[PDB]
Structure 1
Amino acid sequence: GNLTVAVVLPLANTSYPWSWARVGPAVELALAQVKARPDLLPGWTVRTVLGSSENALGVCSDTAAPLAAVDLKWEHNPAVFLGPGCVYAAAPVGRFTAHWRVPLLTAGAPALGFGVKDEYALTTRAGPSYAKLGDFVAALHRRLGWERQALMLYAYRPGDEEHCFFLVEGLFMRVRDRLNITVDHLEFAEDDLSHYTRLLRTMPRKGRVIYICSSPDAFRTLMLLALEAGLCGEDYVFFHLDIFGQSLQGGQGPAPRRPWERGDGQDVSARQAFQAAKIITYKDPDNPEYLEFLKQLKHLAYEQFNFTMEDGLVNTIPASFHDGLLLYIQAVTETLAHGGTVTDGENITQRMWNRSFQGVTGYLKIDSSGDRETDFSLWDMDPENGAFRVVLNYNGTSQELVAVSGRKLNWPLGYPPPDIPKCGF
């Protein structure tokens, strides 16, 4: 027969990690791999039908993605949706597909609300999620004996689609469930530097292990202000939640990175102000298969879409789409092998959840709730060179932290500071 895959992604705005400009080559490579293997959907042809998830301004919209999804459903009758990765379109599209009893694959839509599989039935997230970051932090605290309190700051910009709110919301919700700690939210406006005056006043009393989600330049400015306030590393620890490694030139590959230098003259102070800062990012797959997949993905993207893909940590999202589509194809193959049909949403989807799969991004695990178990990396500075590099790795399947190359976290005192001062608040 013919199996139709319905895609609702940005078709003409090549500025999202899930934009069709960079996800299209991934899906094409996956489908070319399905045809090559006779062990996947024998005697079947997979087809993609495209719908756009953006309004006339060229950005995400929760009012255009549902319309595109409804049009695709009526016209073509797909078997699966390669649904939106965008937090605001993904919600209505997922509600619609849950109503229709159709699976929805996505490597985006990482918000916390999308993981309540009672309202979002049959949806699978093959990419990173924000709640799983809360796991990592927990595994970190147990390691360093921080069991009392924590503070979480997120920045606000008019442009971004409210990214740090969702990131810190997921992190907070999942960390307050697994630890008996007191966690304090806080929001600040990234534009104006007057809020940074209030932030430095209200942070020595409300917390001593801080997690900031602001952008790279905002974080560097805030850290310089903190140094000017005498917030040495002997007391505080600032973790920058930079999931896609934008402050590390993508955070891809073994190279020395200096995220505190801008050639602005004010660098000697910036180096001394990053001695109390660690950076939390997604983890780079470190296998040859991922490198080859990128090598040919960058070529196909240039040829097919006239788009030049830059090296970075945002290619894990196209890789996740590739892996998730292959996993779904395998699940459908098993379903047809056991006397079913491609329209069996429940039997297909429950052969995807709670199992392990081998893809370009390594050996991945889809937990029993339908989301994927994400791995993370912690970057710390070098006392001698002053360059950042990955020091800790976190495997979310086994849920553990590992040192990389016989290099340990660099603390000014030699041990982590207490999350509660000895004679303070």
Structure 2
Amino acid sequence: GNLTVAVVLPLANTSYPWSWARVGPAVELALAQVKARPDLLPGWTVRTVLGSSENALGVCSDTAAPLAAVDLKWEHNPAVFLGPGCVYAAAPVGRFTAHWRVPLLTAGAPALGFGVKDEYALTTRAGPSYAKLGDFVAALHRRLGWERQALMLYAYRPGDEEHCFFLVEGLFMRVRDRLNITVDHLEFAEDDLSHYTRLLRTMPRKGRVIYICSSPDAFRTLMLLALEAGLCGEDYVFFHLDIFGQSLQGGQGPAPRRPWERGDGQDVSARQAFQAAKIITYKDPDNPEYLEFLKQLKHLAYEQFNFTMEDGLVNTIPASFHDGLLLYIQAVTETLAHGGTVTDGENITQRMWNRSFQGVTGYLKIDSSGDRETDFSLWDMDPENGAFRVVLNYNGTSQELVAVSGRKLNWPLGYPPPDIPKCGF
């Protein structure tokens, strides 16, 4: 028989980590591998019927994603959805598919509200989540001894789909649960220098361990302002939540990075200001299978969709769709082997949750709630060269930190600064 796979992704806009111009060859490679392995759905054929989740302007829309999903459901009767990876498009489509009793795979939709599996039954997330980043910092605080207070700033920009609002919402909500610490939750406009001055005035009263979600330019500007304000590294620690490594040119390899450099005269004084800054990115998989998959993905993305892949850390999202789709196909194969159909949403989904799988991105594990366990990296600056390099790797499954071969965190005083000064704030 056949197994339709409805796809609701941006088909023309090629500026998203999940856009069809980069996820298309991932699914194509996955389906090419399914058809060469007798152990996966013996004799069946897997098809894709693809709709678009973007409006007339060409951007994510919660208005057109459900329309496309309903059209696809009415016409083709899919067995699964590679639902939207976009926070605003994913919610209505996930509610529709939960009402229809159809599984929904996605390597996007990292928002916290999507993880309420009473309203979003049968949906799986094979890619990074935002709440899983609250486990990482919780593991930092236990290791570094901070157990009192923290502050969390998130920038605002008119264009983006409130990326940092959701990022820090998830981080904050999970950090409250894991730790009984006092956290503060602030926002600033990313273009108003008045807001930056106000923020530099404010912080000395609210915390000594600050997590900032902003663009690389805004974080460099904040560091330069803080250095002038006197906010040195013997007191503060600034953590830049740059998940896709945009300030590190992707952060895809061992090359030395120096994100404090712009060649604008003040980059001599920007190296000084970054002595109290560390960067929290996703983890770049090291296995050779990932490199081979990237090598043969970059070629399909050119021959098929006439689009050139950028060679960064956003490729993990195209690879996670491949891994998740293969995991789903294996679950469906087991379900059929136990005498079922490809329409048993509940039986199929409970064979995906709470198990480990071997993909190109490593040996991953979908947790008991359906969300994938995410691994992170912490970058710090070398005292001698001045270049940034990875110093800590966090394994989501076992929930522990590993120091890279011959590296350790660079603290100005040799040890982390306390999160509570001599006489508080």
Normalising by structure 2, report the TM-score: 1.00
- Using the TM superposition, give the Cα deviation of residue 268 of structure 1 relative to its aligned residue in structure 2, in angstroms: 1.1
Aligned CA RMSD, in angstroms, stands at 0.4
SS in 1 for 2:193: coil
- Using the TM superposition, give the Cα deviation of residue 111 of structure 1 relative to its aligned residue in structure 2, in angstroms: 0.0
Q: Deviations over 1:93-133 (max 9, x none)?
A: 00000000000000000000000000000000000000000
Match of 1:422 in 2: 422
SS in 1 for 2:124: strand
- Using the TM superposition, give the Cα deviation of residue 194 of structure 1 relative to its aligned residue in structure 2, in angstroms: 1.0
- Using the TM superposition, give the Cα deviation of residue 192 of structure 1 relative to its aligned residue in structure 2, in angstroms: 1.3
Match of 1:251 in 2: 251
Separation in 2, partners of 1:226, 1:311 = 33
1:101 equivalenced with 2:96 (yes/no): no
Separation in 2, partners of 1:139, 1:192 = 34
User: What percent of counterpart residues are identical?
Assistant: 100
Q: Deviations over 1:356-400 (max 9, x none)?
A: 000000000000000000000000001100000000000000000
Match of 1:113 in 2: 113
Match of 2:123 in 1: 123
Separation in 2, partners of 1:227, 1:204 = 13
- Using the TM superposition, give the Cα deviation of residue 407 of structure 1 relative to its aligned residue in structure 2, in angstroms: 0.5
- Using the TM superposition, give the Cα deviation of residue 45 of structure 1 relative to its aligned residue in structure 2, in angstroms: 0.2
Flag as ranges the 4+ runs of structure 1 deviating above 3 A. Answer: none
- Using the TM superposition, give the Cα deviation of residue 91 of structure 1 relative to its aligned residue in structure 2, in angstroms: 0.1
Q: Deviations over 1:334-358 (max 9, x none)?
A: 0000010000000000000000000
1:144 equivalenced with 2:161 (yes/no): no
Q: Deviations over 1:191-234 (max 9, x none)?
A: 11110010001100011100000100000000000000000000
- Using the TM superposition, give the Cα deviation of residue 48 of structure 1 relative to its aligned residue in structure 2, in angstroms: 0.3
SS in 1 for 2:328: helix
Q: Deviations over 1:243-268 (max 9, x none)?
A: 00000000101000000000101111
Q: Deviations over 1:58-111 (max 9, x none)?
A: 000000000000000000000000000000010000000000000000000000
Match of 2:135 in 1: 135
Separation in 2, partners of 1:424, 1:233 = 17
Separation in 2, partners of 1:179, 1:359 = 32
Separation in 2, partners of 1:121, 1:267 = 50
Separation in 1, partners of 2:77, 2:424 = 63
SS in 2 for 1:6: strand
Mark the runs of 5 or more structure 2 residues left unpaired by the alignment.
none
Separation in 2, partners of 1:309, 1:417 = 41
Separation in 2, partners of 1:227, 1:303 = 49
Superposition pairs of residues 38-77 of structure 1, within 5 angstroms: 38-77=38-77
- Using the TM superposition, give the Cα deviation of residue 406 of structure 1 relative to its aligned residue in structure 2, in angstroms: 1.7
SS in 1 for 2:304: helix
SS in 2 for 1:318: helix
Q: Deviations over 1:17-53 (max 9, x none)?
A: 0000000000000000000101000010000001000
- Using the TM superposition, give the Cα deviation of residue 423 of structure 1 relative to its aligned residue in structure 2, in angstroms: 2.0
- Using the TM superposition, give the Cα deviation of residue 135 of structure 1 relative to its aligned residue in structure 2, in angstroms: 0.2
SS in 2 for 1:254: coil
Mark the runs of 5 or more structure 1 residues left unpaired by the alignment.
none
- Using the TM superposition, give the Cα deviation of residue 424 of structure 1 relative to its aligned residue in structure 2, in angstroms: 2.8
Separation in 2, partners of 1:206, 1:136 = 22
- How many residue pairs align between the two structures? 425
- Using the TM superposition, give the Cα deviation of residue 184 of structure 1 relative to its aligned residue in structure 2, in angstroms: 0.3
Separation in 1, partners of 2:200, 2:70 = 49
Separation in 1, partners of 2:155, 2:109 = 20
Separation in 1, partners of 2:285, 2:178 = 27
Separation in 2, partners of 1:401, 1:155 = 28
SS in 1 for 2:231: coil
1:159 equivalenced with 2:170 (yes/no): no
Separation in 2, partners of 1:124, 1:404 = 32
Separation in 2, partners of 1:49, 1:253 = 36
- Using the TM superposition, give the Cα deviation of residue 239 of structure 1 relative to its aligned residue in structure 2, in angstroms: 0.1
Separation in 1, partners of 2:268, 2:84 = 44
Normalising by structure 1, report the TM-score: 1.00
1:79 equivalenced with 2:79 (yes/no): yes
Q: Deviations over 1:155-204 (max 9, x none)?
A: 00000000000000000000000101000000000011110010001100
Match of 2:326 in 1: 326
Match of 1:316 in 2: 316
